Every structure is written in C-alpha cells, then in structure tokens.
Write a protein that binds this DNA or RNA. Structure first.
Lengths: 364, 458
DNA sequence: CTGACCACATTGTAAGTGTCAGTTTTTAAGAAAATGATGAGGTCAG
DNA sequence: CTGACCTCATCATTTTCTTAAAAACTGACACTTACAATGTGGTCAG
C-alpha cells in the first residue's frame, strides 16, 4: 500500500492511538530476563506449545472451534501462511474464488501453475450451485462476513456447501475470518467449522486487524488427515514468528488481557460508525449506501454524472485520497461507479470535517 | 424455561430455543412464526427481550421478515450426516527434548548477550508519539534500515551496493523461495557434498535439478563445474561448512570467468559466518572482485546477534533487482516493523561492534581451552581446521563403527552430531564426528568433555 | 660490532561499583458508563 | 381493525476508568582498575 498526503481511507487500516503501549511494555520487560536464557536459541517450528494450547482454548471459547491443540500451526504474514498449503496439496487442483473478493488468491495463483474459477456473489452470499455444476476442488469463502458488500451466509447455503464437500474425498474448503468478533449485537454465528463432524474443513485466522497489523502473526488449524501430512512432510523448515513474540502474547492472552482489549475496541469503532452514518443521512438523495452494518468500511455509490477516473483524480487533487472499486472485481462494474471507503485510519475528531471536504471536492 | 439470574442473558437463550424448533423440525418451513406482541405477553417478557431473540435470526437466516407481516421461516431440513473420519501420521521430528549438553554447531552463546542495552533501545521506539509504526509501510524494509545496511557492509565487508537494491526477509528459506520463483524452473543448481542440508532438501518440492559435487582442501571442484552444464551454483566462499576449508583466490578467478562465460549464469555466495576469524581479520567478500553484475550476496543477522529474531538481508544486482521490484509489487515483508526500527538504531550507535568483539574473544578463549585439554589425548583423536570456526571435527579411531558411539552419547545424556547426516556418500570408515560448544559456557567445557570422553571408555 | 633476534613495560580503552535525580512501575478507592430487562410510549399499511 | 413493526427512558449490576501515594527503577557522573596493543630494550651471528 501507500503513504498519504492529508487523509486516506483503507479497509486494511486501523486506528492505533487506542492501543495500550504500556500493557504491552510490561509484558515485554517481564518476558526476556537473565533467568530466561533458553529463549535466545531457536525453538519449535510451529510456535511454542503454550502459544498453541492457549489459541486452542481461546478459539473454543469464542468461535466454537473444537480443535485439539497439536493441530494448529503458526505463520507470518498471511500469504506466507498460504504457500506451504499450496505445495502441500499439490498442483492438480483448481481453486474457487469469489469474483468480487479479497484480491489475494488471484495473485498467489499467478505464480503457481494452477488457475482459478471465478463466481458471482449475490446479496445473500456466494453461489452454491455454480460450484456444484463445475468440478472445482477448493473454494475461498468468507462465512462470517463477505468482503466488501457484507452479505452473510445463511444456514441453507452453508449446509449445501458442506454436504457438497462430503460428496467425495477430493475437495477442500477454505475459511477466511476477516473482521469477525466485531459484530456488535451478537458474535455473528458459531463458526463454520463447528457444524462439521466429518473433519473436512480447515480454519484460517489472523492476529493483524484486531491487535496490530505489523507484528505479523497468523495461524491455521488443520483437520486430522492434513495436519499429519503437513508435519510429516515439512519438518525441515523453521518457524517464522519470533520466539520472543510468542511468550509476550501467551501472557497477553493467558491472563484475560485480550478480551479487555477487544471489548474496548468494539465501542471504539461503534461510535465512529454511527457518527459517519449520521453525517451521511443528510446526503441520501444521491450518495446511496449499501451494506449491512459491521466491520470497518462502507461502500458509497455516486449517482452523479461524473466518471470514476476524473472522480479519483479530482479527489486527490485537493489532498484527499479516495479508493475506487475498479480493482477489487474482475469484471466491469455497473454504470454507477461504486466506491469503497474505510474510516479506521482517520482520526476520530476529524470525521466530521474530512467527510465534508470529500463531499465538497466532487460536488456540493 | 428458567434462564433469568443466569450469567447467560435471555437473548442467547430464547434465540437458542428457536434453534430447536427450526432445526429439529418441530416447526415446519413456511409456518407462521408468532408475532412479537402475542409472544411478549405469552412469555411475560417485554418486547425488547424477544425483539433481539429474533433480530439475530434474520442475519443467520433462520427466518425472513415481511415489512408489514410477521416473520416467516426460511430454513430447510438440514442434511445432518454423522461419520467421523480420522487419519494417523508419522510426524517426523529430529530434535530431542530438554536434556543437558547440546553441541549443535548452530547455537550461539546465550547468557552473554546484552539484555539491558536491548531493553533500553526498545523503550525509546514503541511509545506514544511513535504510532504510524503499527501499520505497514514499505514492503522491502525500513528505508533507514536499507541505508544503514548499505553503509555497514561498505565499510565492514567490502560490499559495494546501494540500498535501493537491498532486500530484507525472514530467515533463509523464505529468503530462498522468492529466488527460486524469481529465476525459473528451467535451471539446475550446483551444491556441495557433503555440506549443509538446506538447498538439497529444499528442492525436493520444485521441479529443478541439483548436481552433487565434492570438496577438497582447496575448495570446490571448479574444473568439474566447468566440464558440466549447470547454471547457478551454491558455494560458501569465506568459510566452508564443516571443514573450515577456504576457497583459493585463483579458483575464484576461474569461477568468475565461468559465470562470465554464459550470460544466464549467476552465483550464490553464502557467507553465514563472518568476522569470527580469530586472527588476521578475515578474507574480503567475493563480490568485491566482480565488476559486471553476475553475483548475488546472501547473509543474515542470526549467528551474530540472536538465533530467534529471524532476520536476514540479501543484495541484488541492478538488472535482477529491477525485475524483482517490477514482479513483486504486491508482497509484504515478514520482519516486524518494530524490530527493523529497533535494529536500525541498535547498529546506528555501534553497539553491535562491541558485541562482536566480546563474543569473538569469548569464543577464542573457549577454543584454545578446549584444544589445550583436547591435545593431550591424540593417539585416537585428530582435528581439522582448528584455527577458525565455532565447532571442531573430531575423528574417532576406535575399532568399531560410529552408530554405537552416537547412541552412547544419548545413553549418558549427551548430544552428539555424526557427520553421516551431512554426507550423502558413505566413504567414512574412520568416523568423523563434529562437535559444537558455543552454547556451553567456559566453566562447563571441562566436565562436559570429561564425561563424554569417559563415555567411550577413555 | 652491527643488523637480527629475542624481550619485557608503558598505555589507552572496556569492565566494576556507588550516588542521585528523574521518569518511572505497582496498588488500593472512588467514580462513571455500558449492559440486559421492564415499561411507557412512536407510525403505518392492508 | 386488528394487527403489524418500532422511539424514548431508568432501572440493578457490573465490568471500565481517572486519581493519589510509596517503591522500584535507570542515567550521567565519580572514579578506580584489568586487558591487551606497541615501543622499547637485552643479547645473538657472520
């Protein structure tokens, strides 16, 4: 991504002034001491055993995942967590991507021999019959929340996809959490793995939109057949999460000091959501709003007569960074140029003027 | 039906009792779900309790709303199948648990690292006005970090490279796969054998091919590579694992000309261990001689500074770096921005040089002490390449094969490292055993050597 | 009897301990604000 | 014409939240000492 002049909007951003520096510093200055000389040398390759038992307990008590600790595996970034899966499965597969989606599996297949099968996505979710008619083997879905429109899978389509997977032994399912645990009224839904008693789906979650983008931890769980294969085939690599950054989070989330950050962050964001919605409700004549209320971003559609190209350059001409939707979807978009905006990285006390200047830039 | 006074509120109970009626089939599809006002009186609860018992189910999709009519069920009979697949695994791992006396050649001394300077440097970085450092910036490392590395190597190792080329990454393996994908799958790679078990095993996945070679006291079979059709080669110039062999300079002109002969050839130079020669500084870096952009530099901060910070660097020549930037504009780095902005100051104020000096002197002292205790028994034990390195190679001339010797180390709770693992060909009739000491401090060398030597009956 | 060889003594820093003065963690208390549950209402079609 | 979906408050309770005091910390200094390089001074070999 890019640096900003004045203000920018980005879904992957976050508002960071609210993060407790000091409750991190205390754990750090506890963790690496003179008595602790063994941590300097290289540890295990899947993360330290405590950092996995604790993730097991956390996910069981927050998302319904019933995973015995030794399955889960750590990784760094997100994409570097994926490759090891690609070469693990093989190169005789074709992966199912939502055509509007998070443009990741597109760029991680441009460098491997496989190719991808696009799909259309409706206001309820992804298709479930288009996969059935085609012979795709792996699909990359967002059961908890659909980037960037916000649709949520019902029970019917989820049960159809799971029964589809159970049809034969040659296909696998990717779950991508994105921005869950931020669902306000409830906790969204018992996560998709919970419904499975067939050990046929993998879990993929992150620590980089809820805690910190730049500390670079992620984690997946593997079912009984795939975890053993991965371990037995990949013992000779080395873990990529620093062993000093495992014990800090083991304390930071072992004594109950992560939930007290999540609960605070929910509010931190809800008020901003309501303030921006209140500011926009005056402007309902033209700048329509699409999307169920959750997460960190909204998609505004502009029914003015201006085009996406001159719109974006006019926005950036007066030191305002706008983010057009042309890139996120493979096909050409509709006549009203959809625009995705995120509010996370903007300062709270400047929404009221930043949004106003943005709306001023194009037309009053 | 009593769910008051529970720590569990009434929302996720009534919303949980509708689940039974819809999923278990007591309420059919399309049936009229009673509206709230009839229900609110029915259960004695107010509307705002049962309201959110339902307003959740619209998102989960168990029911659907009609704007002026009651909520209606839209949830088919679920296809519940009960079959529990389970698969066992071999789960290979070659490392033993917490037991005394580890002699692994990778370990670096742990107790002597300046914890306190580390913490002091850390405290000044992650602070209140230092936000903008929890989100991601540039993907190719801190700009200050690149400039600092470029100035460090240019005056400490003879490297001539500008920062714009330099690359930072995570370890070595993840620093190598971005190179395999960068070059292609039509190449064949030249390795050393016996040697380091990384590039041989790491290519058990990719289509590419590898050519085993052999190592003399001069170095690698440069003429053999000349009389072959390999394209990009892996060598360890300034020191050679694990014999301490050093590449002769004339062979270095030969290898430079070998690479220069054909345009598509490139040379991997991996000087993992540097500035750790006990005497006379160390040989200058190979790429200082090359003038026409045919060599890439690979090195890391992971035996010098700390084993577990997982950081490395890598230099690219201008045509290859340009192409790497064009084709990799979307990846993001794997080194925490905080670690980068900490180490930039940590080496901006010169403390790393002091650490180098202290550990260098510590390790020399350990090696002369070990040699002076090692030297008295020489009827059966001999050493190669003593002058430099963090490890020794110990040949055992007892009249019996090496497997029992290796296992007897773990019989008495000692960790030993036979060279058979690093060696493809088995031409070792007198066993070669390599020993490391770097993790064990000075005061324990005596007892460790005594017990391990007694283990073999000495 | 001189250039060579062999020969210790001066020297300029890293390594150890005490003071102090400054920001600096740890702990108990009073106070604020949000949550779930009750209750009184709100508008609007067919 | 019932019936339907829906906007305000004040509650009991608790899990966040700003405050003031006393104890642990760590910085620039005082030096003082060890460590190990270099210049030096003794005789040696035709």
């Amino acid at each position: 991504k890019q640096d900003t002049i004045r203000y920018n909007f980005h879904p992957t951003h976050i508002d960071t002034t609210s993060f407790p520096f000091e409750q991190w510093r205390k754990y750090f200055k506890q963790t690496m001491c003179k008595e602790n000389h063994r941590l300097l040398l290289n540890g295990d390759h899947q993360g330290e055993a405590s950092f996995r038992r604790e993730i097991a307990y956390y996910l069981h008590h927050s998302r319904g995942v019933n995973c015995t600790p030794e399955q889960v595996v750590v990784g760094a970034g997100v994409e570097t967590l994926l490759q090891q899966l690609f070469l693990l499965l093989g190169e005789s597969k074709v992966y199912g991507i939502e055509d509007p989606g998070y443009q990741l599996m597109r760029k991680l297949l441009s460098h491997y021999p496989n190719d991808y099968v696009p799909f259309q996505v409706d206001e309820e979710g992804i298709d479930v019959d288009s996969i059935v008619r085609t012979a795709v083997d792996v699909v990359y879905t967002t059961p908890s929340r659909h980037f960037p429109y916000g649709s949520v899978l019902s029970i019917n389509r989820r049960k159809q996809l799971l029964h589809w997977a159970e049809a034969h032994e040659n296909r696998y399912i990717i779950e991508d959490d994105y921005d869950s645990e931020f669902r306000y009224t409830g906790k969204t839904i018992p996560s998709l793995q919970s419904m499975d008693v067939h050990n046929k789906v993998i879990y993929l979650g992150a620590f980089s939109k809820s805690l910190i983008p730049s500390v670079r931890i992620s984690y997946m769980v593997l079912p009984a057949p795939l975890a053993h294969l991965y371990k037995n085939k990949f013992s000779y690599y080395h873990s990529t999460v620093s062993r000093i950054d495992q014990q800090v989070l083991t304390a930071f989330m072992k004594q109950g000091d992560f939930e007290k950050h999540l609960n605070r962050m929910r509010k931190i964001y809800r008020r901003k959501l309501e303030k921006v919605l209140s500011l926009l409700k005056r402007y309902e004549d033209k700048l329509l709003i699409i999307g169920e209320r959750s997460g960190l971003h909204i998609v505004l559609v502009v029914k003015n007569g201006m085009d996406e190209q001159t719109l974006v350059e006019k926005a950036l001409a007066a030191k305002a960074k706008v983010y057009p939707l042309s890139a996120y979807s493979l096909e050409r978009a509709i006549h009203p140029p959809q625009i995705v905006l995120g509010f996370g990285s903007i300062p709270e006390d400047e929404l009221e003027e930043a949004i106003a200047t943005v709306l001023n830039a194009w037309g009053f | 039906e009593l769910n008051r006074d529970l720590p569990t509120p009434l929302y996720e109970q009534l919303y949980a009792h509708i689940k039974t009626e819809i999923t278990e089939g007591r309420i059919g599809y399309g049936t009229k779900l009673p509206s709230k006002r009839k229900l609110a009186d029915s259960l004695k609860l107010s509307q705002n309790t049962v309201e959110a018992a339902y307003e959740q189910l619209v998102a989960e999709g168990y029911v659907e709303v009609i704007p002026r009519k009651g909520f209606y069920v839209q949830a088919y009979e679920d296809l519940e199948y009960i079959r529990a697949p389970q698969a066992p695994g071999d789960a290979l791992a070659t490392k033993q648990d917490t037991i005394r006396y580890n002699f692994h050649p990778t370990h670096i001394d742990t107790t002597s690292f300046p914890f306190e300077q580390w913490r002091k440097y850390f405290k000044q970085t992650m602070c209140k006005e230092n936000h903008r450092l929890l989100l991601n910036g540039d993907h190719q490392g801190e700009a200050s970090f690149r400039r600092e590395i470029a100035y460090y190597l240019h005056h400490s190792r003879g490297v001539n490279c500008t920062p714009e080329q330099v690359v930072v990454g995570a370890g070595v393996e993840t620093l190598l796969q971005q190179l395999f994908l960068l070059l292609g799958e039509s190449k064949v790679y030249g390795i050393e054998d016996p040697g380091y078990q990384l590039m041989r095993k790491l290519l058990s996945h990719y289509p590419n091919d590898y050519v085993p070679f052999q190592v003399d006291e001069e170095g690698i079979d440069v003429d053999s590579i000349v009389r072959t059709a390999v394209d990009v080669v892996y060598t360890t110039p300034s020191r050679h694992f694990p014999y301490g062999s050093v590449l002769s300079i004339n062979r270095r002109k030969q290898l430079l000309h070998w690479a220069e002969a054909h345009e598509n050839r490139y040379i991997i130079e991996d000087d993992y261990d540097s500035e750790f020669r006990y005497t006379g500084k160390t040989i200058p870096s190979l790429q200082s001689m090359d003038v026409h952009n045919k060599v890439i530099y690979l090195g890391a901060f992971s035996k010098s500074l700390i084993p577990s910070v997982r950081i490395s660097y890598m230099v690219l020549p201008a045509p290859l770096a340009h192409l790497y930037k064009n084709k990799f504009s979307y990846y993001h780095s794997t080194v925490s921005r905080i670690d980068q902005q900490v180490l930039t100051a940590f080496m901006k104020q010169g403390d790393f040089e002091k650490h180098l000096n202290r550990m260098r002197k510590i390790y020399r002292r350990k090696l002369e002490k070990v040699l002076s205790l090692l030297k008295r028994y020489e009827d059966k034990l001999l050493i190669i390449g003593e002058r430099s390195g963090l490890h020794i190679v110990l040949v055992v001339k007892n009249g019996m094969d090496e497997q029992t010797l290796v296992e007897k180390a773990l019989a008495a709770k000692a960790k030993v490292y036979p060279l058979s693992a690093y060696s493809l060909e088995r031409a070792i009739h007198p066993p070669q055993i390599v020993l490391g000491f770097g993790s064990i401090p000075e005061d324990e060398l005596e007892e460790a050597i005594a017990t391990v030597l007694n283990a073999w009956g000495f």
